[PDB]
Write a protein that binds this ligand. Sequence first.
Ligand SMILES: [Zn+2]
Lengths: 128, 40, 45, 58, 179, 171
Amino acid sequence: EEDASQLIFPKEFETAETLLNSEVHMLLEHRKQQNESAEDEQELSEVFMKTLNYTARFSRFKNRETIASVRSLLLQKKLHKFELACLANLCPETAEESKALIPSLEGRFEDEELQQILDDIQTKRSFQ
Amino acid sequence: HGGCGRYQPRIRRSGLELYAEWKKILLSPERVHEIFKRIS
Amino acid sequence: PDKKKILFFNDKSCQFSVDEEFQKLWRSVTVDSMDEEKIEEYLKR
Amino acid sequence: NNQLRRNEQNGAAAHVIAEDVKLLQFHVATMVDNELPGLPRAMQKSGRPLKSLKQRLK
Amino acid sequence: PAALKRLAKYVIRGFYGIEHALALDILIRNSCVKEEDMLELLKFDRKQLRSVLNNLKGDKFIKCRMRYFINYRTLVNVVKYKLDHMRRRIETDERDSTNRASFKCPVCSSTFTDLEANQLFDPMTGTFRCTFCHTEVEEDESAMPKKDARTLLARFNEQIEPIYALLRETEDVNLAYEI
Amino acid sequence: MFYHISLEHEILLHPRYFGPNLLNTVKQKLFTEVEGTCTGKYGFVIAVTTIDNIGAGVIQPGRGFVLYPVKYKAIVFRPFKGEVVDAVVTQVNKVGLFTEIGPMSCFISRHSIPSEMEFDPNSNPPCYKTMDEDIVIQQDDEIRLKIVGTRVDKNDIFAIGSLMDDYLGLV
Ligand SMILES: [Zn+2]
């Protein structure tokens, strides 16, 4: 019954500000930077590095200002903020894919619009 | 408001059953239950 | 009445017997209750 | 319950159903409260009337 | 309403039994039907005739016209009433869940979902192991054959329409004739 | 969806901790049994960063303990049905493809994998590949999948996905 395809969130997710794999990745070392100082503390948990070893092997962007801009990129757009985080961790390249990835954005804008942001993404993403 | 014109019986009660004559109909639990099922 | 009053009588040209009808005869026991005819039309709408 | 289920599972004469629906009404009005006037009391042992639920918290 | 007595010819055939049907045959003529005449004619029992009449009264099949001497006339518009409710109950028993192929352990006859045995799924054996006993799981087995019931009901409940087509059609065409 | 939400909790202190450094002792005891132990109703608690305020410690009658309510902001992950995600394959089997997203487990049934990528048990690493072998998805491969359904039990989360949808496969 609880599906994000039909966009059913619990009413507790009104102030649920989100983030993607890189901002998670940023503070994950700061928690490791917390384990550097504040001695006389025991070992870490298991899920802490289990997620850290996972989402550090793959990233969505490269550095701070790469995201500090992409959040200002979607800033002026008429968006649900749930929309930004879904494709921020998708990296699509064709507009109908993105609308095949989203059961909800067929009927919002022109197809090339999100493709242009997809172009804006693939223009800022430094592939190697 | 509500629309109807019929009468209501004088519902008696006997032991474990209840009668009603305006035609003495002994009421059923399913009947009065469906009656109750519609009160707003 | 067991073996008392009798009417030998003849009529036939084929018919159907429904097992689900036997359940339905017993799943439609409402008798007096009213407000059912309108419900049938609402379920077909 | 089990004997009425099969008896109106096959379409009985619609007259044994009155005198057994009164039996069910009596039996279920026997468990909760027995000290209601009328309603001839039920018994199992040596003249022991039933100790109904409302009778259990006197 | 000669073809209204034809839907009637087909329901008596289709439903009510000889004892009922013989009485229902008399109901054919809606001119005059007394209680003494119907008793003497049917050669039935009086208590039993009263039971059938009471049963027909339950159908609201007849409008008891008092003098006291009686008269009896058709009320059933419940041909749809049997239909809408029976179709609902059969579609409930028909509409199944899903493949619902939960693992089931044949030794302890315990029931699992595809999800239940997934946590159990044992990577060293490439198959699903039951919880408290490592015996391999099986199909939901018998459990609920609601899928076989769906198929059966569909053949059986919709297979009685052809033999009812004569009346389903007469009623429809007769109702149109009645206006 | 990684969310940054605010929730609260209460801590029972044993009377041997009172005295100086009482307040910080509530802090260390907060980190342990709140993070790294994920629940089912709110999602996955990964890490906390700020603790807003500590209420007043109500001494309950008898049994010594004093309860202090606390308010904190913790980043939480809670995936939803219909969500599309990149995952890593952990095990390949004939019934399907096992992938894993962070601490969460994920099952991809074979019927929900395009027929072009047929299962290959013949390869020493079990895998999924095109007949032309244009791609060979196996263990520890990075793929994108669509959540068909999600689960939350005691502390472990699972989801189920499909590769049949467009724009899916290796990433
Ligand atoms: Zn077992």
